[PDB]
Amino acid sequence: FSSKTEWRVRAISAANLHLRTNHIYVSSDDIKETGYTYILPKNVLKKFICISDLRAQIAGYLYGVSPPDNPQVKEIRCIVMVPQWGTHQTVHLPGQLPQHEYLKEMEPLGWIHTQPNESPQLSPQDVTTHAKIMADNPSWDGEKTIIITCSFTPGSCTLTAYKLTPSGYEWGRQNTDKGNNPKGYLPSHYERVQMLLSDRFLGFFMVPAQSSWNYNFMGVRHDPNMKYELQLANPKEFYHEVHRPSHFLNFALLQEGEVYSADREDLYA
Amino acid sequence: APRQVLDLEDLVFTQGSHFMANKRCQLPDGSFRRQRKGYEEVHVPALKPKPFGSEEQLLPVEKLPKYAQAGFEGFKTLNRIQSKLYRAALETDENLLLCAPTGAGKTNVALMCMLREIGKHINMDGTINVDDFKIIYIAPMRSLVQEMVGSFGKRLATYGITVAELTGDHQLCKEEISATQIIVCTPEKWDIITRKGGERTYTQLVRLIILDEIHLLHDDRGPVLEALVARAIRNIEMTQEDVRLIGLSATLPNYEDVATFLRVDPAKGLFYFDNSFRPVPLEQTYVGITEKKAIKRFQIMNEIVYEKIMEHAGKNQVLVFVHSRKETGKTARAIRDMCLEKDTLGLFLREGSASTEVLRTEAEQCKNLELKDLLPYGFAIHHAGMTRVDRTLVEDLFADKHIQVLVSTATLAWGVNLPAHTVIIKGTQVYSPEKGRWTELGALDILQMLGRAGRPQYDTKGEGILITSHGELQYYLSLLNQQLPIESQMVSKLPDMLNAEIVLGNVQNAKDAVNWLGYAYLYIRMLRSPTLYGISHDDLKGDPLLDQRRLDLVHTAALMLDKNNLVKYDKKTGNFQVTELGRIASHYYITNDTVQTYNQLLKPTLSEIELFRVFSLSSEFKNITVREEEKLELQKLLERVPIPVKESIEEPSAKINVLLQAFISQLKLEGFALMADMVYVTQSAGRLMRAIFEIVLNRGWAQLTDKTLNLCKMIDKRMWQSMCPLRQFRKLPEEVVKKIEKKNFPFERLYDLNHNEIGELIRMPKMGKTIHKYVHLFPKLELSVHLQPITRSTLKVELTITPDFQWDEKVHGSSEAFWILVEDVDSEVILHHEYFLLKAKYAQDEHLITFFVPVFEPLPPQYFIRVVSDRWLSCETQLPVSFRHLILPEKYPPPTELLDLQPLPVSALRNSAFESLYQDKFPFFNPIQTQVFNTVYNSDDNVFVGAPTGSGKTICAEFAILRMLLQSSEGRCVYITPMEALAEQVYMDWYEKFQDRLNKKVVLLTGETSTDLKLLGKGNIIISTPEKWDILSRRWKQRKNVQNINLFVVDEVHLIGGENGPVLEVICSRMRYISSQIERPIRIVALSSSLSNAKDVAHWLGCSATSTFNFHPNVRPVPLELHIQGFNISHTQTRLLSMAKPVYHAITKHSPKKPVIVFVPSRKQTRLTAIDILTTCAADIQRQRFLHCTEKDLIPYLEKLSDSTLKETLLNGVGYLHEGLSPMERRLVEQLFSSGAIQVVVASRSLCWGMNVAAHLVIIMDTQYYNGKIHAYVDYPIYDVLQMVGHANRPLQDDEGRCVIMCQGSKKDFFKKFLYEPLPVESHLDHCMHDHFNAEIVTKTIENKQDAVDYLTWTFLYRRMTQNPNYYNLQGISHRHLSDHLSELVEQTLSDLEQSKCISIEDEMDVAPLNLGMIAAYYYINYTTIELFSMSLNAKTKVRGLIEIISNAAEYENIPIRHHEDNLLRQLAQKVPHKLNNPKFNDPHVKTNLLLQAHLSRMQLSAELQSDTEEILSKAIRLIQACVDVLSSNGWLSPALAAMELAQMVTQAMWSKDSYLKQLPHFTSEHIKRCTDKGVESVFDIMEMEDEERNALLQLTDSQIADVARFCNRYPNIELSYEVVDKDSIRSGGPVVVLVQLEREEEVTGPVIAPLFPQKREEGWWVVIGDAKSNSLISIKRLTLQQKAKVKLDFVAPATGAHNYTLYFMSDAYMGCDQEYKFSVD
Ligand SMILES: Nc1ncnc2c1ncn2[C@@H]1O[C@H](COP(=O)(O)OP(=O)(O)O)[C@@H](O)[C@H]1O
Ligand SMILES: Nc1ncnc2c1ncn2[C@@H]1O[C@H](COP(=O)(O)OP(=O)(O)O)[C@@H](O)[C@H]1O
């Protein structure tokens, strides 16, 4: 980013993200039928789209349970936002997975992220990210956890859901190179999975304890090994004042400017 | 005739206050025009003072009244004009107008007008007692207000009267300025503050308002002053209470018009003085410049300045007023460099080299400003900008004449007062950001700055020089000589003025609007100069009164307000209706174009980016434009702002936006134009942004109300949130703040750190302590919540706010404001919000707020409860309220349908004798009754009938009663109501319905066990209240009269829900248990209001669903129209006051000609509201509309009255009812109302229950009331409200009944939900539990834990627990869930009961009652009470202790605390016999101690607390006796005997050491002197008296002597005989038996005579034995005798058998019958 002009164009843009919110598409494609099927409550989806930005990927972590007596469907009941920052093609979020009390009741279902340009494939950066989570986390089950990619289409939003195949998981555990075309990448690595939106139940948010989630505007304050706690509260928007301290901390001024126009007229209170 | 629309644009005056209505002017005498090249110059000489009139002298400060003289010190004589009008000032309330030139000293005239009022309230032994009056001083300028409060304070301080500026934000400082008198303010301040209502708490305490510099009428600001005064006058006409008005003006024509406006009688009230009365004569110089080109002009004026200044360069003083900030010093240095360019000519401003103190100007060298350059020479500069103190240091320098040239600004003339020999006004033109352009300065600005010309002391005559543009040269002559008309700019503002008056409710319709405008200055000006104001003389003749013009006028305003949605007004009715948008508009003084711009622009989804733009679009900024030259800087500023403007390019929107940001971001601006502009924008921004917040909050859109309140704070504090909150404490160093901002360490993480750990972060440890102070000074709340579901739709929330911060009134001040708002799942919608305000006193006191919130079909994971400070930035606490475990109640089945039946005639019951008590009242039973009839009458089974109050269920009960009547001659029936008032109300009816007509005896239960027992069993129908029927019937196993009852009736069973509900529940349950054991069925009939859960109640009380009738509130004999009126004012006084007018209107609307009842929160409020109804009754031009008979008819009724105001209120048809009224007064008022004589009655809330007179319309006013105990207001209990509502029923006549409920904003939705729906009812037994288990264990109804659980299953609690488990904190709906719950319950109840030693728990299974519990159960006393007793009473306790111990009793915490009872009880406690140890005066235990001592000292108090005293006394004796029992059981002689003594002292109302004779009636204290001097010390002494000296002692009166004789007969004459059985044979451990034998020769008749006691009582006696030497109670017994007794008591012999003891004998009532006999055994 240009860090001056680049900030503002996208900033007055994102104030319209809520317009997208009511036009969304969902990939319908061939159902494995032996697979799990994930239901995403619409409210969290709306809010998640609304906090995002149209260039930097933001990501969120999925937490849910399967409804009683129906083990093959996973309701996503919660999204957790952790300290993070994006690129246009990927997202850097820390090594620690969410730990918190409200979360103990549910299982992790993977993660969801915004995707500035729509691609009909799981980006190598993703399969690599996911495998590398999975390597370090037994908590995440290969077969149960997914990557939901939410892409910004014109005036719209459109989303797909992927699972790593074991081929993919091994490649990704192995993979170093984060470029858009790493060696040995294959369409054999991922698999699409069945997902539905729902108005039947409401999902909720988990959000960083002492800060907010969006570190894009401080990259030096973000570290892979950084630790965080959580709370029950909603995410602030991308360009929210808090995510942007450096800019509100731009004041170089001498007080005596106030000497000029010392006619104080007030008369009201 | 129909109105016509007109254009208000061409009808106003542009360039107001520069108007110059006259196009012709005048010379003064010696004046001449001399025109030079490029400039005309006009000269007028000084005026000639009017020669002193024949025998006219000045008045010294001696010869005017004694009191006022104080505070005039330093001043020996009065000014000529002051001396002229002082007489009318202090001797008359007649309104004043003075017109006198600047310098005449007008203030000190008005001061006197104040010293009169200050004198109107005075006392001998105290002076100027200050709560009677407040004065309002309106001054035109801010500096002037400041300095005025400054000097007024000093001056009036001798009186000790507190005068302050009103700069207050409304809410924090109201309660601050409450105690403030003579408050000074700008007209505007007064107008907003009146529009909000901050004034309406002040007014009617205002006898005086000063309008200072009232010629401001001519300014654009004029309409404000016009709005003030108009309101004041128009208001006085309604209230009939008057006010003095004192106008002060510069000398100008139109004086008589301003006189008419102020309602000043021209005869005695008008005062005029021309320009000759200026104390320092003024020679006027005016140079107008003809040059068109400004470029040449900015030379010419420079040169005129130079020549004029060199003219005075000799010994003299010049002062230059420039209208620029910077040019104060740009004008100087021009004069300097010119004098240097003059070859050192003009220099030597002194008498020599060293002379005239050039070392004064040189030695003052180093200073803050640019002065260091100018000061070495002859001149300097002054203004607010460059320095603070050096301004005062320059003023000191000018007064002492060390500087003869000073260039400055208008704020110097308006601020601290110093004159100059000659002053020179450069240019007269200023920059108006409001107007967007340059304009000539105002009238008052020149008048003020040129009225500074010449000194009062060091000067002979003053001159002044106005350098202006030739075109305006005429204008400035019409001013400074009196040629100028004062005209009103009112038309421009007319739409905004009208709104705010509708907003205050002062104008309902078009007519009231024309009436209002008839009070305007513009009205008298339109009358006396129509030619100027747009009225041709012919159509003026056609409408002389201007009725049709004032109707046309205001019609356009009405249309403008309608089109912008401030008002909904249809042309047909002519009526206005206010909208919330309108109110917001008025309250923020924002124009009606801006507000509609906000209405259309503002949407829920707005970003900050957009919020700013919408702000920028405010119509208030319409004239602001962007100049080419500044567009260079604006761009830079545009890239240095945090919030993107980029939506807009360079246009006004951008300029305004970037400006606001610049101000918040704290940025200095190079251009002057931009600076002034920015100032305008930011000053208006507070009100603007705030009105946005208010709007967007009322809508409920969460996110944007956050963004907007935060913006508000950011404007107020001048910073972004991203900056450290510590900055709002200005006390802090900047570098330290910046240092803590350097490292990012989140602020809320500062609380964990101590003083050292703080300093370690920024490595500045020296600061470590101070920082800490601030961190804990920063307002912090912690909050807890208790949540329980009410219905599937609604949850109840109890929020507990606990202050976490250290209060300092030099920071937090008198009050701190917080918004609590509960937001929905996404923090999207605000489900509810309240304004919570924590006062100074109550920091550290946890406040409890209770409110309900809705829930919706996809039950959400949680709500959020947010709390945020109003003014404080970055100060917030959020509380997730999680529903993850919530279990919603079962949805409630539909109410049983009201069948369509042939309405049942009274001819149904075949009994004629029954028909008789109905037929002559009503022809037919209502559908409810007729549907219940066959079930309740022709059939024997238990029924439940719910129908909303007013449905006639009483006679439904009477049906069942009649059935029982047929069933058996002697058939027995018990009837219960939860309200004692309602009980008496039932008894009065049923006694005539049954005992009178049907011969069947009817009774009403009372306090005493004995009398009550005797009562039932003689009666067929027993009417009682739950407590009376608990104590009796707990023991039911022994009392056959309890068991044999045929019918049992519970009325208002929904009352189970409320407190004192558990007792009701427990007695119905018990009733069922009895019917279980008696083997005979006992029919139960229960009556409730509409109940959603009626099924449970029925199932509990054993009604089959087929006999259950639960009806919807929409089924009522007489339909009800319910209306709810929300009021957004949280402060209760203001709210209550501002619903006064709506009350009257509610009558005139809903029930103009029909009976009306008004319920009020306060005992006293009833009077006040009756008054206000009458005073606003006059307004309507309609007097005594509520009186339906002539005054001659009311006289027989009014003869019976004490209350004097009640006579008045009744005379006009109102009247009131409350606690203090004599029962005769009340009966009378009720009679007058029901008979139809008076149409309206205002009644205390307490009387809602026991009131036997109904109405057509009922208006509930303000549903909260005041509780002294927690010092807060608390809502009316819902059932109460429903009862008040049910009080509008008139089935005999009306086809409808009406109710209006005026309540707070918060409480609106709650009523909207729960008044219409049937009500849910839950059990409270779980909380109030111990007492009953104890009592029941005592009866051996609970023999062991199992019996306890079983007992639980008979209750309503048992029923409800599984229905709505989350309410009872039961976590599951399962079997073992409920089972485990009840188990844990009896477990802890029995444990807590065993800990208290009321029971013993054996093996862990069985239970038995112990001593304590036995007592408790016997006297019906709370268990904690007698536990307290158990740990309190000791061996050495005596009456001093017994007073406080018996006071702390639980039954005495029901005693409440009223408005300001903290001073009252202190004043009483001062004078009582026993003082207390640091007592809190809001505590009811303390209050009952003091009331009790008061009763013992026979002190007569107010009837208010006297009622209270009587209630305490009612239950006192029981407690006392319980103490006797605890003490005797514990084995202590002295305290026991003393307690019996206390019983006696309470009975006869006297202290322990006192005359025993004072028990006799008509016996004074002065009687005791001669009685004791005679030698007669007791009643046994006056027994022997024959009829010779008996009445011949002191006073002889046959009636009183007989009244004493009956007492003497009734006084106990009792002879005992005591022996020890087999005295000579006694062994250790052996039984000792002492037999006592009582007899009485006194005639046995009647009860104890003790007139000072509310209860009738019998003679109780204790026969005690004890060894008095060891303070040991050896034995005891209790008895009631009546003419014969035999009482034997025994104990266990100690030691060897050679011993001696004491026999005692004692009463509970009479003093002095106590008998001791010391005896020896062996
Ligand atoms: N009796 C007096 N003795 C001394 N000074 C006086 C007296 N009466 C008035 N003044 C002077 O008059 C000035 C008051 O100005 P005034 O004409 O009251 O202004 P305003 O327009 O506010 O009424 C004060 O500076 C005061 O010094
Ligand atoms: N059949 C009837 N026709 C007209 N009015 C009735 C009838 N029955 C009762 N009322 C009126 O209803 C009032 C009491 O209403 P009710 O519902 O019985 O009291 P509650 O609600 O306390 O049980 C009485 O004042 C009586 O005048």
Ligand SMILES: [Mg+2]
């Ligand atoms: Mg009743």
